[PDB]
Amino acid sequence: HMISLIAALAVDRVIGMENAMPWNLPADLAWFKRNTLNKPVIMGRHTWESIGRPLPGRKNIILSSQPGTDDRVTWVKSVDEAIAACGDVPEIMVIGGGRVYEQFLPKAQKLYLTHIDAEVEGDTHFPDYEPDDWESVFSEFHDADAQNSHSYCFEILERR
Ligand SMILES: NC(=O)c1ccc[n+]([C@@H]2O[C@H](COP(=O)([O-])OP(=O)(O)OC[C@H]3O[C@@H](n4cnc5c(N)ncnc54)[C@H](OP(=O)(O)O)[C@@H]3O)[C@@H](O)[C@H]2O)c1
Ligand SMILES: Nc1nc(=O)c2nc(CNc3ccc(C(=O)N[C@@H](CCC(=O)O)C(=O)O)cc3)cnc2[nH]1
């Protein structure tokens, strides 16, 4: 049907550090929940470990080459099996991390991207996507506030 990627990117497309999120942005985690609730979410094993528990109200599908270690989620061994395990849904949400985003970007018709105005040390990056292939269909900028220590911009891109 449709595969979408959702991610939050700091400067230089940094998305992770030492298997952790290198910022605290509750408005963006709220945006993540709004856009993934009641959809299947595909993630790599490292990201499963960084989240630390099943995302409620979502079918959690974990890519790993090795046997599953938690029966509260669905474990799959390949990209194609991950997609199949989602069932017939209107939209599959791929939620990272870097290695999984790389594999699903060529398959994706939509990107939900938060651009965070934060300079951050990172060992993991969102894939380097060709801008000519993508049209911005939504953009919403927000200044920092008492709850969110960085300004940030919500964007949705659709593949041209
Ligand atoms: N800010 C964001 O938007 C965002 C989103 C997600 C994660 N992150 C950050 O990203 C970092 C983790 O990303 P990552 O790139 O290190 O790891 P990852 O992509 O989350 O997971 C990588 C692992 O998933 C499994 N995997 C991936 N593709 C597979 C395939 N085709 N077949 C079988 N197994 C497959 C392997 O597990 P085995 O080694 O078990 O085979 C691989 O080691 C963390 O720092 C996390 O905080 C940030
Ligand atoms: N836009 C975006 N921001 C992120 O922080 C993000 N993070 C991941 C991977 N990491 C995480 C880490 C924590 C939670 C999490 O705890 N979310 C809960 C709480 C929502 C909230 O705090 O508002 C959830 O129910 O979704 C989700 C993904 C994947 N895509 C993303 N996409």
Curated annotation (Swiss-Prot):
- Please describe, based on the UniProt annotation, the reported consequence of changing residue 21 to I/V: Increases catalytic rate 2-fold
Keywords, A to Z, come to: Antibiotic resistance, Methotrexate resistance, NADP, One-carbon metabolism, Oxidoreductase, Trimethoprim resistance
Q: What is its EC number?
A: 1.5.1.3
Phenotype for residue 155 to Q:
In strain: 1810
The reported result of mutating residue 43 to V is: Increases catalytic rate almost 2-fold
Which gene underlies this protein? folA
Task: Quote the record's miscellaneous comment.
Answer: The strain K12 sequence is shown. Strain B [RT500] is resistant to 500 micrograms per milliliter of trimethoprim.
Kindly provide the name given to this protein in its UniProt entry.
Dihydrofolate reductase
Q: What does this protein do?
A: Key enzyme in folate metabolism. Catalyzes an essential reaction for de novo glycine and purine synthesis, and for DNA precursor synthesis.
Q: A GO CC term?
A: cytosol
Q: Which residues form the DHFR domain?
A: 2-159
Q: Which residues bind NADP(+)?
A: 8, 14-20, 46-47, 64-65, 77, 96-103
Taxonomic lineage from the root: Bacteria, Pseudomonadati, Pseudomonadota, Gammaproteobacteria, Enterobacterales
Task: Please name the CDD domains in this protein's record.
Answer: DHFR (cd00209)
Q: Which reaction does it catalyse?
A: (6S)-5,6,7,8-tetrahydrofolate + NADP(+) = 7,8-dihydrofolate + NADPH + H(+)
The record's section on PROSITE patterns has: DHFR_1, DHFR_2
Q: What class of enzyme is it?
A: oxidoreductase
Task: Say which family it is in.
Answer: Belongs to the dihydrofolate reductase family.
Q: In which pathway does it act?
A: Cofactor biosynthesis; tetrahydrofolate biosynthesis; 5,6,7,8-tetrahydrofolate from 7,8-dihydrofolate: step 1/1
Cite the binding residues for substrate.
6, 28, 53, 58, 114
